[PDB]
Amino acid sequence: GFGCNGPWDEDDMQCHNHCKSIKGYKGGYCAKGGFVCKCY
Secondary structure, three states: OOOEOOOOOEOHHHHHHHHHHOEOEOOEEEEOOOOEEEEO
16 A cells, blocks of 8 residues: 555655655655555
């Protein structure tokens, strides 16, 4: 979700911007097989 639509369709910047909107998360990227927007 949040841009992470599998290993061939990873809108990392959508995921990153989504994570940053979850105030306190530093960033994010597609992970764990490509369908997970992983925030940190």
